[PDB]
Design a protein around this ligand. Structure first.
Ligand SMILES: CCCCCCCCCO[C@@H]1O[C@H](CO)[C@@H](O)[C@H](O)[C@H]1O
Ligand SMILES: CCCCCCCCCO[C@@H]1O[C@H](CO)[C@@H](O)[C@H](O)[C@H]1O
Ligand SMILES: CCCCCCCCCO[C@@H]1O[C@H](CO)[C@@H](O)[C@H](O)[C@H]1O
Ligand SMILES: CCCCCCCCCO[C@@H]1O[C@H](CO)[C@@H](O)[C@H](O)[C@H]1O
Ligand SMILES: CCCCCCCCCO[C@@H]1O[C@H](CO)[C@@H](O)[C@H](O)[C@H]1O
Ligand SMILES: CCCCCCCCCO[C@@H]1O[C@H](CO)[C@@H](O)[C@H](O)[C@H]1O
Ligand SMILES: CCCCCCCCCO[C@@H]1O[C@H](CO)[C@@H](O)[C@H](O)[C@H]1O
Ligand SMILES: CCCCCCCCCO[C@@H]1O[C@H](CO)[C@@H](O)[C@H](O)[C@H]1O
Length: 182
């Protein structure tokens, strides 16, 4: 059992971007991938999403990717690539927006998308067990610890609590909708 294409390309893209940052420096990469930081850049649409591709520390990308690999993988295998694509696109946009609004355009990471994924996987398993998707009991605990780490700023994750809540809201919403069909 190997992780699907969406799960795989995201991880590799994040690693490729991370390397570009070690070489060129965080600054340079952000100049090109950050959420529009100036009116002159408002129509460079990739920026509304590419901010999720940057990470600022080893622990940052390590945990983001472990979570993305486990949850993203599960969703893609059990619900398809399309399902993961939408959750990722929407959460990336919403969280980025909330982040930008309250703290400025200088941020990055897949943590907003991770919160959405934790929300979706957990909620869907609780409401629609047999759907096959669910967040392993023991992993709920480490998920909560990862959450607490960011919430009380014990672990630097780039994004603020408000942006992470927006990410979570997206995953909970989609999970609510999905366990609403049948
Ligand atoms: C939340 C994760 C979202 C990841 C989305 C990454 C999308 C990258 C899209 O880039 C686009 O690729 C084109 C290729 O030619 C360029 O021409 C264009 O200028 C550029 O904008
Ligand atoms: C702005 C949100 C849109 C998300 C942007 C997704 C960009 C996908 C770029 O990936 C490439 O897609 C090709 C599709 O054929 C594959 O052949 C190729 O292997 C893969 O590397
Ligand atoms: C403690 C916080 C971090 C938890 C990280 C759990 C990682 C579990 C990774 O599992 C892998 O997932 C892929 C996609 O589902 C499968 O293709 C693969 O066979 C499986 O081995
Ligand atoms: C939130 C979205 C994040 C980016 C998602 C990118 C998915 C890119 C999928 O690539 C696809 O991989 C297949 C297997 O290799 C190729 O056959 C195909 O040509 C290519 O299109
Ligand atoms: C720094 C924290 C690192 C935590 C490492 C946790 C290792 C145990 C995780 O087990 C994983 O559980 C998933 C759910 O059952 C399986 O799908 C997967 O195959 C299995 O590998
Ligand atoms: C993303 C974090 C989501 C909230 C975590 C909830 C912790 C409180 C326990 O809840 C649920 O209680 C059931 C009965 O004990 C468990 O069987 C189930 O596994 C667990 O989920
Ligand atoms: C509620 O939480 C708040 O969310 C904001 C949104 O990011 C953060 O700016 C702020 O620091 C945090 O206290
Ligand atoms: C459905 C989408 C979910 C969006 C969630 C938005 C929550 C943003 C939380 O706001 C925060 O509240 C604190 C107290 O009011 C302020 O101190 C802080 O500056 C502000 O950032």
């Amino acid at each position: 059992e190997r992780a699907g294409p969406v799960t795989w390309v995201m991880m590799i893209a994040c690693v490729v971007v991370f390397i570009a940052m070690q070489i060129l420096g965080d600054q340079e990469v952000m100049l090109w991938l950050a959420w529009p930081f100036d009116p002159t850049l408002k129509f460079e649409f990739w920026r509304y999403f590419t901010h999720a591709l940057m990470h600022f520390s080893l622990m940052h990308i390590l945990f983001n990717l472990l979570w993305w690999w486990y949850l993203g993988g599960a969703v893609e295998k059990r619900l398809g690539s399309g399902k993961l694509i939408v959750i990722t696109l929407i959460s990336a946009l919403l969280s980025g927006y909330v982040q930008q609004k309250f703290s400025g355009p200088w941020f990055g990471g897949l943590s907003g998308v991770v919160y959405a994924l934790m929300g979706y996987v957990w909620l869907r398993g609780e409401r629609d067990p047999q759907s096959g998707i669910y967040l392993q009991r023991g992993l709920i605990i480490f998920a909560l610890i990862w959450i607490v780490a960011g919430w009380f700023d014990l672990f630097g994750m780039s994004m603020a609590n408000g942006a992470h809540i927006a990410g979570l809201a997206v995953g909970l919403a989609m999970a609510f909708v999905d366990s609403l069909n049948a």
